[PDB]
Design a protein that fits this description.
The structure is cut from a larger assembly and holds 2 copies of chain A (48 residues).
Chain A (H helix, E strand, L loop, with lengths): L2 E3 L10 E3 L23 H6 L1
Antiparallel strand pairs in A: 1-2
């Protein structure tokens, strides 16, 4: 959920109001290296 | 889970008893396209 900086006169920074007046509420987002799978090709070819 | 048409006097298609008298109660059924993991092949080989 998007957030918007508070008056932030002194530390209310992360402290923030809802940004819902600007963005949606539930919004997708994924963090970190992307998931994947791994495999070998050439060795499998030769094995077959 | 499963069912059967009721006495069908009117608008009773979804109006249903439990047909599972003849079936199981938690039969496994999938929805939509199956899971998949795409991977390009030729360019990978050439790059190797």
């Amino acid at each position: 959920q998007a957030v918007k900086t508070t008056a932030a006169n002194g530390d209310q920074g992360n402290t923030t109001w809802q940004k819902d007046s600007t963005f949606a509420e539930r919004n997708e987002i994924g963090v970190g290296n992307n998931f994947a799978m791994e495999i070998n090709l050439n060795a499998n070819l030769w094995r077959n």
